[PDB]
Amino acid sequence: EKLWVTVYYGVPVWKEATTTLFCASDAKAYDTEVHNVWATHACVPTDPNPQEVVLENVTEHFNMWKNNMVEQMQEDIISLWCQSLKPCVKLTPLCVTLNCKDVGEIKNCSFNITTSIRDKVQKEYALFYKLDVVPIDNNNTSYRLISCNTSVITQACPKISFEPIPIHYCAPAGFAILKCNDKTFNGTGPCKNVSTVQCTHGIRPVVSTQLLLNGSLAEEEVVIRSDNFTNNAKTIIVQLKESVEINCTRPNNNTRKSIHIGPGRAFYTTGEIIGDIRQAHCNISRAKWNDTLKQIVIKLREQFENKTIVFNHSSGGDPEIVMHSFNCGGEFFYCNSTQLFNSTWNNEGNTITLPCRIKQIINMWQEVGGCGAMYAPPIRGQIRCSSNITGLLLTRDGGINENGTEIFRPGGGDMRDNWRSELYKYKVVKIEPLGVAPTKAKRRV
């Protein structure tokens, strides 16, 4: 009973590895000639009917903290934003001392400027916030831009919008993407409801801090996942069943005035503000947040932390991390957010009004990528944006406390964690169809 060997073409073997992924869109961008930042126009359209296939009698290990596909997601957003800000107007000769006067949240800063014609002096004025200008004096009203030292400040391109439309990632042909939608997934463990997909669903490439917006809701109930709960410096990612919504706006009605720098370059800024001045705020409805927080602490009392938990605000210090970042309509918000964590969970306002300031000159991508600063141009009129809170980023505080459990702070202060809350159930493999097996065949010839 001698046995020979035979080959087999079409053998499913995974042995996961790392590759380069595609970009796909839903082709719902009917508004032509928009051409947003992430080049959604420059992605392959027409991918309907995502025919998923079910897998059975199969066990394999999923991982999320050791995933390297999310590194590609974080690498793209650094490159996607950097390449968009290159081919439009720079405003680098604006590093001039400003003789401002209070008009207050906003300022009436004025300066001497040189037009496109050289050796010409024009008295032009703009409006800046406190978060964009810093003084170098004792009491003199001189002001200068925040990032003029060892950095280059460029203007965001005006005709390209910041709308967060979803995109779909896809592996190349021969590479499969697996997914797990088993109920109450641990985060790092074997799965049973494994289903191969042609390619993954729509990721939302929105950037946020201290919260998560426009994510995917949970399947059954509020799940909390992490690597180890015993460590102090590790982040915590949560997911909600009932989405918390915000109906908020920014009443700051004004007009945009084009100030020439330059040889073809144009500096955009707000001019004659119209109407009663007001600050940026957002309402969060009570009986939908503390009720939501009640659901979160139901299994936060499970076998990770025992009892006597308490919610606290951010640590403080560096302002660019501790507040909650926000973005809608082309404006970047940095918001007071201590009122959502001023409570203690142990065993009369209708809505929560969060004050919030506006930072036109951001520095978020420079400290991780070094591409440069960004001057967000002002947006005409009053803008209003509504979003759903679908996740929170919590981090415990290291210390000693014999009587009670250590406090919880929301200042995660990381970028990669914002994309692991939606790519938590995806894994890329390579399919080599080869394989050998013995049988009874002699190759007669």
């Binding site: 046995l3 380069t20 009698n57 080599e432 050998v436």
Partner: protein, 124 residues
Amino acid sequence: FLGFLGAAGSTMGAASMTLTVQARLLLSGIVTVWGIKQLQARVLAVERYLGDQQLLGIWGCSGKLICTTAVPWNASWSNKSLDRIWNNMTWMEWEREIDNYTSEIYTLIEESQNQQEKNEQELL
């Protein structure tokens, strides 16, 4: 129609019937920072397919799926019988017990083909 990657964790015998459903959807899928990622990953599938298309095209196969080889299955590696491997393990399970030997297996399957090409050549 079990679809792409269908009976993959299933029986060996059932997986011996649907080899070709993993072959037609292997290279034909849907079709400047996204453009370079589009191009450098499309060509990554073409050369990876041709990387193991020679391997079919050298040993015994020309373009067929299940071609026989005259290697006599030396007993150094796993020696499970016919009623064991074809009954209650999947293809992913079988690949875990043979993965390190494939360096020696592949250079031996391509062997005894030049030894065969002479036999047909000298007979004419």
